[PDB]
Amino acid sequence: KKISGGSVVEMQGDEMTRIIWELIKEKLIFPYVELDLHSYDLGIENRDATNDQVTKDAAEAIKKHNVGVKCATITPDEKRVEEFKLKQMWKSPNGTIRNILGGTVFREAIICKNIPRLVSGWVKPIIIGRHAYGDQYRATDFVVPGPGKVEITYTPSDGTQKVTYLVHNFEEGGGVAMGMYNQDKSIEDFAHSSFQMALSKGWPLYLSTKNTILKKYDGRFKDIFQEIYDKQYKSQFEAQKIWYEHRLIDDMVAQAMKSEGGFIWACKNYDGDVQSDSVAQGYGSLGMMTSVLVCPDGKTVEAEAAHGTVTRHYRMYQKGQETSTNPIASIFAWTRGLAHRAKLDNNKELAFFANALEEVSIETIEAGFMTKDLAACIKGLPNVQRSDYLNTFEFMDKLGENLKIKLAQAKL
Amino acid sequence: KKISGGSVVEMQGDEMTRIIWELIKEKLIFPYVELDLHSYDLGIENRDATNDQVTKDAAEAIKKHNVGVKCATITPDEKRVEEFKLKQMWKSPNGTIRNILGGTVFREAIICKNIPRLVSGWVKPIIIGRHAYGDQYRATDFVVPGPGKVEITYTPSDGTQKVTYLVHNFEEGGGVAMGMYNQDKSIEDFAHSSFQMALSKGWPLYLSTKNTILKKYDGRFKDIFQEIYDKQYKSQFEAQKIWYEHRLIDDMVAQAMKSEGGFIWACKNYDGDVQSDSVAQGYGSLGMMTSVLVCPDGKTVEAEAAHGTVTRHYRMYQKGQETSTNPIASIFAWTRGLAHRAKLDNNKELAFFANALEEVSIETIEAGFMTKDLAACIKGLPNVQRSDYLNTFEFMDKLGENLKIKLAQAKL
Ligand SMILES: NC(=O)c1ccc[n+]([C@@H]2O[C@H](COP(=O)([O-])OP(=O)(O)OC[C@H]3O[C@@H](n4cnc5c(N)ncnc54)[C@H](OP(=O)(O)O)[C@@H]3O)[C@@H](O)[C@H]2O)c1
Ligand SMILES: NC(=O)c1ccc[n+]([C@@H]2O[C@H](COP(=O)([O-])OP(=O)(O)OC[C@H]3O[C@@H](n4cnc5c(N)ncnc54)[C@H](OP(=O)(O)O)[C@@H]3O)[C@@H](O)[C@H]2O)c1
Ligand SMILES: C[C@@H]1CN(C(=O)c2ccc[nH]2)Cc2c(C(=O)Nc3cccc([C@@H](C)O)c3)nn(Cc3ccc(F)cc3)c21
Ligand SMILES: C[C@@H]1CN(C(=O)c2ccc[nH]2)Cc2c(C(=O)Nc3cccc([C@@H](C)O)c3)nn(Cc3ccc(F)cc3)c21
């Protein structure tokens, strides 16, 4: 019989990723796993039709059932409003879900021995976590049109003495100014997620800051992480022969690049961005990275591919043209989700399945069966021949055949 | 007779780079060029002995003579303080020089046809530099001890308006808050350095901004660069068949990835995250990148290798073990410095020399004579045989022999 997988929240998306998402379910998941599936259609037409209520209901379902797996979705701009005749320029469903759940966004690459990367020596992923403070977390920047003083004041709730700090007195010309903040509770949540991620993986954790420039602001992150480590995690880390260390951002980047990988990196940046850094995009654009939101309760996770809907491929698909879209990141959104479900329910069979599907995916690519973009990584796009890659459907078929063999081997 | 090279500020450094720096001068520079050499010993023992006065004097000399060439130096940490029994944990000489001169740092790769790169199609360097305020910049950050409102106000000098922006109302606990600013003059300086770098190279310039969180900050950089281009550089650029364009980071990364290179990339800074400028320095670990500080004046230049003192190789050298340290980046700090000196003085003979030394260096590697790290790039470190590379001294000897032949050919 099939594995009884339990309660999973699944969010359907848009364009090419919507096609691949259905292929993953029909070919890799449903033949082996039975789910109490809480399925939400976050397709742009359905979000428009429901006045974005579907997104809010999907976020509430993840909060209730603790496991969410999300397909890439269209974030509307002026062009999308005209394309689909939208009622409004709906907000990013990622942003809406992230604001409702809160938590730390961790980014993890899928590594294949034959697939080039920035550093040859990187053999284990470098998991970078950025805390989501929200879109209710208002960054306060403005133009200073001309001379005058910019001041920042703190007024205690208890009526006690107001404190005023001079940011700058613009004596000639103008510029720009900004105000930023972080609550201690948000730093504490970021710390807990980071320490638990490091223990979960059995890897060391590094926190990077600019505490040389932001002595009080970044110093608070450094002190809170250190206090939490000393009081709640030091014993556990020493027992796994791992450690926690703070690093300045410049030292951390240089050290990571001379590393073999295999560490957690809690990244405290200035603007509170949670998106991948610029250079990670050269690898995320391959369909080889996931984004996992780890919520402050230590029970709720939301997993998704770290790429968009692949519009360019969807247009080819709409014209009946052959496509070669990499489903790896979307598959790993499912496996990372299912592995978390297995951990919460102590479901050994589901935990085995999720790990086996990850192994099958990496092994298929490593055996030389891959989509066009991966073949172009190895050979160079001008040198790629049709015999070097598999189309979307052929690649999914190969994964399905390989998964069947793998699960048969597991029986004996 | 030798070339009369003029006034150059030279800073001696530490460990393996100090050995190579003397070899460069004795074998590649001094047999051909006579200099009014302003030489400063920035060796860690001398900085300690002079209470870092030597560093400040070397920075003043660069300001006066416009051309500086710097050897890699030790930046002290707790371990270095113990190693050399230092009086203080002296500040980075780079930081001290940068604070005194001002300007923007640009990274420039040295490219060899047989040396693999991140993108195969990169045949000309992508000269990347980011905005950065000096150490003089004081951020207004503070602890928020408990609940209360944090607000940032702008009061124009003419007393007619007052704009108050709510940063955050801390309802539950305290945290941290900051006020930050950018003066228009600082953005203008970054723009001028970038436009002058593009004209100096005869290449187009691109400015990148994120435009996702601090849009008014990003917008000010975009407007200032465009205004400066239209009013002071557009004619000069059109005359050199080059151009200036603004691009969003994501578009810039994708474009750079499909480019052949040969452009200036000025990055708006996003401190605390993994920046393209810090990532670029990883190519410097091969000894194949320089860092050039360019002041907005267009007259003052400080050049250095984009790597450190190579301590690991220095320890081998101390034990009498064979080393293979790449001197290319240190040689290009000299040639980039000497080429700038030649431009300021209209010295055709010095300009020929600097370019000939750059050609000799690239040609030697391309003919298959290189250090171990470059041989490992091509073949993979486990497959490198002793016959695939030259040790430090053998490589310098080959460059010296090749330079002698090249300059003899130039005469006849
Ligand atoms: N997480 C999300 O929900 C999410 C994230 C980002 C963007 N978006 C949405 O995505 C839509 C389209 O964005 P976009 O096309 O600019 O970005 P994108 O879908 O990530 O695609 C950019 C390019 O990267 C390549 N690529 C990305 N993922 C790939 C994969 N799985 N397999 C193969 N190639 C892959 C393709 O390159 P080539 O064209 O060279 O083949 C593609 O055209 C937008 O409407 C945006 O709102 C959603
Ligand atoms: N601009 C500067 O003055 C500057 C910049 C950075 C660091 N530093 C100082 O440099 C010292 C050493 O720092 P570090 O060892 O972390 O950094 P590093 O000197 O850049 O060396 C790191 C590694 O990069 C490789 N490498 C760098 N340059 C090389 C070259 N020319 N040829 C061959 N291999 C090269 C070597 O890798 P392998 O180990 O695999 O052989 C080396 O061990 C420290 O005291 C630091 O403060 C100064
Ligand atoms: C560390 C994360 C995630 N990854 C991994 O963990 C990984 C993959 C395989 C083994 N490990 C990949 C990766 C890459 C990457 O490969 N960029 C890339 C860019 C252009 C062209 C190409 C082509 C060759 O594919 C690649 N960059 N970053 C951002 C980063 C960089 C420097 C830091 F210090 C910090 C963050 C990352
Ligand atoms: C573009 C700039 C400057 N470059 C050049 O111009 C260049 C070099 C050769 C010909 N041209 C090099 C470079 C590098 C680079 O090579 N980093 C690196 C890091 C670790 C380890 C290694 C090697 C040892 O494995 C390399 N990264 N960036 C940042 C970037 C990357 C991808 C983007 F899409 C956008 C920004 C850059």
Side-chain angles (χ1 to χ4, degrees):
Chain A
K1 62 128 201 155
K2 294 183 188 182
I3 298 158
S4 164
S7 194
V8 168
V9 182
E10 175 251 341
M11 295 143 275
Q12 303 177 267
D14 291 299
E15 301 184 321
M16 204 70 226
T17 43
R18 181 184 188 94
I19 294 145
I20 281 145
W21 197 254
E22 289 300 311
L23 290 176
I24 291 162
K25 286 193 290 185
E26 73 161 301
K27 305 189 102 73
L28 310 174
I29 313 302
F30 292 170
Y32 304 104
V33 184
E34 284 301 0
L35 298 162
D36 288 330
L37 197 67
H38 307 268
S39 177
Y40 296 83
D41 189 343
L42 306 201
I44 191 63
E45 307 92 338
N46 197 51
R47 285 181 275 142
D48 195 60
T50 68
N51 293 304
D52 211 34
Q53 187 60 56
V54 66
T55 311
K56 297 184 244 178
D57 289 356
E60 285 302 302
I62 300 158
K63 202 171 184 179
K64 185 186 180 72
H65 301 292
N66 306 300
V67 176
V69 300
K70 185 191 173 288
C71 178
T73 48
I74 288 163
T75 298
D77 60 7
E78 278 184 76
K79 288 180 177 185
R80 296 303 203 166
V81 169
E82 313 318 308
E83 182 184 358
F84 298 100
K85 299 167 199 161
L86 301 176
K87 302 170 186 174
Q88 285 183 45
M89 201 172 292
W90 305 108
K91 290 175 189 174
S92 166
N94 304 113
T96 302
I97 296 156
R98 213 186 296 129
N99 301 334
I100 292 160
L101 302 174
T104 311
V105 178
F106 294 95
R107 296 174 184 277
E108 190 179 3
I110 299 96
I111 309 173
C112 295
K113 285 147 170 167
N114 57 330
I115 299 306
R117 73 294 310 251
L118 184 69
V119 177
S120 271
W122 284 349
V123 288
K124 283 182 179 181
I126 286 165
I127 301 172
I128 301 169
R130 290 169 182 94
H131 205 68
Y133 306 104
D135 270 291
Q136 56 93 187
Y137 167 80
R138 294 287 163 177
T140 307
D141 65 325
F142 51 93
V143 171
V144 173
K149 58 175 164 79
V150 171
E151 296 162 295
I152 187 155
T153 64
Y154 165 63
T155 305
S157 294
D158 64 7
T160 291
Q161 266 260 262
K162 178 187 75 171
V163 61
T164 307
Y165 296 94
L166 179 62
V167 174
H168 190 57
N169 185 12
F170 289 80
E171 282 177 59
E172 234 188 70
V176 71
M178 66 92 119
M180 271 268 171
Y181 77 94
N182 271 297
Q183 296 194 142
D184 281 335
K185 196 24 174 73
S186 300
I187 304 164
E188 286 161 9
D189 289 349
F190 180 36
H192 282 296
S193 293
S194 302
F195 288 117
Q196 293 170 25
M197 180 60 73
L199 282 172
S200 175
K201 299 284 179 182
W203 293 341
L205 166 71
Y206 302 95
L207 164 75
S208 73
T209 77
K210 201 88 182 174
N211 83 308
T212 46
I213 289 89
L214 304 186
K215 289 178 192 189
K216 296 174 181 284
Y217 202 105
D218 285 6
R220 193 78 156 198
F221 278 72
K222 179 178 177 272
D223 300 341
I224 287 170
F225 265 70
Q226 196 51 244
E227 282 163 26
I228 291 180
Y229 182 63
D230 288 345
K231 206 178 153 204
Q232 287 164 78
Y233 295 100
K234 201 182 187 195
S235 298
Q236 301 173 269
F237 271 63
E238 282 172 329
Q240 290 193 227
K241 287 88 207 179
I242 58 168
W243 56 88
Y244 163 72
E245 274 171 29
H246 166 273
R247 293 282 194 269
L248 251 35
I249 185 53
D250 311 87
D251 297 337
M252 191 66 242
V253 175
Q255 280 299 98
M257 291 185 306
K258 290 164 184 118
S259 174
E260 293 187 75
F263 58 90
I264 316 301
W265 174 350
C267 180
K268 167 45 184 60
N269 57 41
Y270 277 30
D271 63 3
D273 201 359
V274 107
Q275 298 304 322
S276 59
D277 53 275
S278 313
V279 185
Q281 293 161 12
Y283 202 83
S285 272
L286 294 176
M288 300 295 272
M289 189 137 344
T290 62
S291 174
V292 181
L293 182 69
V294 176
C295 300
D297 62 5
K299 284 174 193 292
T300 305
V301 313
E302 197 233 5
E304 59 200 311
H307 61 71
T309 64
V310 205
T311 309
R312 200 190 68 90
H313 296 205
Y314 184 62
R315 298 307 178 210
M316 290 177 248
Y317 176 83
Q318 285 181 298
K319 292 165 180 176
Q321 294 174 12
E322 187 176 62
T323 58
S324 189
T325 318
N326 187 8
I328 296 304
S330 305
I331 288 168
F332 276 67
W334 279 91
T335 63
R336 294 177 167 152
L338 293 175
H340 186 71
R341 174 81 277 154
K343 190 185 180 167
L344 292 173
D345 299 356
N346 221 285
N347 189 333
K348 273 138 191 190
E349 294 74 18
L350 184 62
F352 183 79
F353 175 82
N355 259 315
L357 178 49
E358 293 193 347
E359 293 310 330
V360 166
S361 302
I362 291 163
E363 292 162 5
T364 301
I365 292 160
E366 285 180 351
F369 299 96
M370 66 194 73
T371 56
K372 190 183 178 163
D373 66 324
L374 293 186
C377 277
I378 304 166
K379 290 185 173 278
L381 184 63
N383 311 316
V384 171
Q385 292 172 78
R386 184 60 189 85
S387 66
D388 293 329
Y389 65 89
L390 299 184
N391 71 36
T392 303
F393 307 92
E394 290 168 330
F395 185 68
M396 287 293 312
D397 287 341
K398 189 75 189 180
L399 291 172
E401 296 159 37
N402 281 348
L403 180 58
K404 195 188 170 184
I405 295 153
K406 172 79 80 180
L407 300 173
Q409 283 167 11
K411 292 184 194 299
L412 225 41
Chain B
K1 66 128 201 156
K2 292 180 188 182
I3 298 157
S4 165
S7 193
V8 167
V9 183
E10 176 249 341
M11 295 143 274
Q12 303 179 116
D14 291 300
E15 297 181 321
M16 203 70 227
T17 43
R18 183 185 186 90
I19 294 147
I20 283 147
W21 197 253
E22 290 299 312
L23 291 175
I24 290 163
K25 285 195 290 186
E26 300 314 308
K27 306 187 103 68
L28 311 176
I29 312 302
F30 292 169
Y32 307 103
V33 185
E34 286 298 0
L35 297 163
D36 288 330
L37 198 66
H38 308 269
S39 176
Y40 297 84
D41 189 343
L42 307 200
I44 191 64
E45 308 92 338
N46 197 51
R47 284 181 274 142
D48 196 60
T50 68
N51 293 306
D52 210 34
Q53 186 59 57
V54 67
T55 311
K56 298 185 243 178
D57 288 356
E60 285 299 304
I62 301 157
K63 199 173 185 176
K64 185 185 179 70
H65 302 290
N66 305 300
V67 178
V69 300
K70 183 191 173 288
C71 180
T73 47
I74 288 162
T75 296
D77 60 7
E78 277 181 75
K79 288 180 179 181
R80 295 304 201 163
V81 170
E82 233 171 71
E83 183 185 358
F84 298 100
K85 299 167 190 197
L86 301 176
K87 303 169 187 173
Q88 284 182 47
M89 202 172 290
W90 304 109
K91 290 178 182 180
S92 164
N94 308 290
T96 303
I97 297 156
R98 214 188 328 274
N99 302 334
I100 292 157
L101 302 174
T104 304
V105 180
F106 284 95
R107 326 278 166 186
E108 190 179 3
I110 293 109
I111 311 167
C112 293
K113 285 141 175 131
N114 55 332
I115 300 305
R117 301 144 304 261
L118 183 58
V119 170
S120 284
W122 284 350
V123 112
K124 283 183 181 179
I126 286 164
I127 300 173
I128 190 152
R130 71 167 182 89
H131 170 70
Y133 251 100
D135 288 31
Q136 196 175 274
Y137 182 85
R138 306 278 130 170
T140 309
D141 62 328
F142 51 94
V143 169
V144 172
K149 57 177 166 172
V150 171
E151 296 162 295
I152 185 163
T153 64
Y154 168 61
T155 304
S157 294
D158 67 5
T160 59
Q161 279 187 233
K162 183 162 192 158
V163 196
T164 304
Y165 298 93
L166 177 63
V167 174
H168 188 58
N169 184 13
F170 287 80
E171 284 176 62
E172 144 269 299
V176 285
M178 64 183 180
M180 224 76 156
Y181 76 97
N182 259 244
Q183 284 187 130
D184 275 344
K185 203 274 188 279
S186 159
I187 302 164
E188 284 162 9
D189 288 350
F190 177 40
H192 282 296
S193 295
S194 302
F195 288 117
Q196 296 251 349
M197 179 60 72
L199 283 172
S200 177
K201 300 283 175 198
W203 292 341
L205 167 71
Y206 301 96
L207 166 77
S208 59
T209 67
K210 187 188 293 188
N211 199 68
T212 308
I213 299 153
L214 278 356
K215 291 170 204 162
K216 318 246 203 300
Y217 246 79
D218 288 348
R220 196 76 166 178
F221 279 72
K222 178 179 176 103
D223 299 341
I224 287 172
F225 265 68
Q226 196 52 69
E227 283 164 26
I228 291 180
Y229 182 63
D230 288 344
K231 206 176 179 178
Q232 288 164 77
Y233 295 99
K234 201 182 188 194
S235 297
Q236 302 174 89
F237 270 62
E238 282 172 329
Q240 290 196 39
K241 197 77 206 170
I242 58 168
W243 56 89
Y244 164 72
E245 276 171 29
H246 166 273
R247 289 213 114 182
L248 253 28
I249 293 173
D250 304 89
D251 297 337
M252 194 75 76
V253 172
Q255 182 205 306
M257 294 285 283
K258 290 166 186 252
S259 176
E260 71 179 289
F263 58 90
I264 315 303
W265 181 0
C267 304
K268 206 262 142 186
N269 56 318
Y270 298 89
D271 293 1
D273 217 302
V274 182
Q275 298 188 260
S276 285
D277 173 273
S278 305
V279 177
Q281 288 165 73
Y283 191 73
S285 76
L286 291 177
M288 295 295 273
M289 190 171 263
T290 65
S291 293
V292 182
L293 173 67
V294 300
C295 301
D297 67 5
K299 286 173 197 294
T300 304
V301 149
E302 198 234 5
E304 57 200 310
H307 59 72
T309 63
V310 207
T311 310
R312 200 190 69 89
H313 297 204
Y314 186 63
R315 298 307 177 211
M316 289 179 250
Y317 173 83
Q318 285 182 300
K319 292 165 180 176
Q321 295 174 11
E322 192 171 58
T323 58
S324 189
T325 317
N326 187 5
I328 296 302
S330 304
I331 287 167
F332 276 65
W334 279 91
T335 64
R336 294 176 167 153
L338 293 174
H340 186 71
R341 174 80 277 154
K343 191 184 180 177
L344 292 172
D345 299 356
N346 220 282
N347 189 333
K348 277 137 189 186
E349 295 72 19
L350 185 62
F352 181 84
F353 176 80
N355 182 68
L357 178 49
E358 293 194 346
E359 291 179 354
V360 165
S361 302
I362 291 163
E363 292 162 5
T364 301
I365 293 160
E366 284 181 352
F369 300 97
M370 66 195 70
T371 56
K372 191 183 180 165
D373 63 326
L374 293 186
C377 276
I378 307 165
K379 290 184 173 279
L381 185 62
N383 308 317
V384 171
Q385 293 176 278
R386 184 61 188 84
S387 69
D388 293 329
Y389 65 89
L390 298 185
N391 72 36
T392 304
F393 306 93
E394 290 169 330
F395 186 69
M396 285 293 310
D397 288 341
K398 190 75 190 181
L399 291 171
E401 294 159 38
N402 282 349
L403 179 60
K404 194 183 179 164
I405 295 153
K406 172 80 82 176
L407 301 171
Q409 282 167 9
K411 292 183 194 75
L412 36 90

